[PDB]
Predict the 3D structure of the following.
Amino acid sequence: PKPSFPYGSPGELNSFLPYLLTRITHIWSSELNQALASEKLPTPKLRLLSSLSAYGELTVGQLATLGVMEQSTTSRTVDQLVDEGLAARSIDQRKRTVVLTRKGKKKLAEISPLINDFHAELVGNVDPDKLQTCIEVLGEILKGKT
Amino acid sequence: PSFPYGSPGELNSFLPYLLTRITHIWSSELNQALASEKLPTPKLRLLSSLSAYGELTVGQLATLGVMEQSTTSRTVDQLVDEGLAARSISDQRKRTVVLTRKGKKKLAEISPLINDFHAELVGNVDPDKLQTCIEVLGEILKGKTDY
């Protein structure tokens, strides 16, 4: 009779994906905001460059999506990176899209070494080929939920 | 080898990007869904944990619920006043917190929604791929906190 919500031991919760996702995400996001605090290229500014670096030219609605951010906040953090010279505006079709500038690449490239090193500690000593299974699963899950 | 995330396929294979996107989807859905039961993911998280754990200090509720002892202490105080929890005493004197009869019945009344959301979330993944996914996420975390 598999365990169903609500779970009845500490060990059952330990196998409930939605609980695991959050303890680990609070953990990644916690250790990184305070190691980023140094460069003070905040998670806000980090997330958005990361997404444009990956998808190329994005709308602000799209940035708030990939970047897991509110639409207004995105746009604020976007006018920053523009005025700080890290991204610029453009327009293909016609609504208001954002792009990465050469200034923005380099900024990324600089923090990059830190992000990776955190990834490696995160993953720690997990089996590689099981960490491939896990990230294909999670990638399948994010496809079916949007 | 992959870091410089210059592609979706690469980003979307970055565990902390998946971990973030997926986490946000789940709690916004449930917070929203349960908004009439006034069970936003905070209050629900704690009760969830009280169910699974049994008796936690204001402090273990903080860890498990990824919050600050004050905000938790406040989340805890809504639940004692909504009729879903009770501040108790350890079998020593560390200030702990349990579910009530109404609180227990509340997660019970709620469960079809959560398990339905959970079925939605992790539904059509190969069940063995999923078990592995779960083992790994549990491995990864153990190594960080041990609680």
Observations:
- Chain A has one domain: 1-146.
- Residues 1-146 of chain A form a domain with the Arc Repressor Mutant, subunit A fold (CATH 1.10.10.10).
- Chain A has seven helices and three strands.
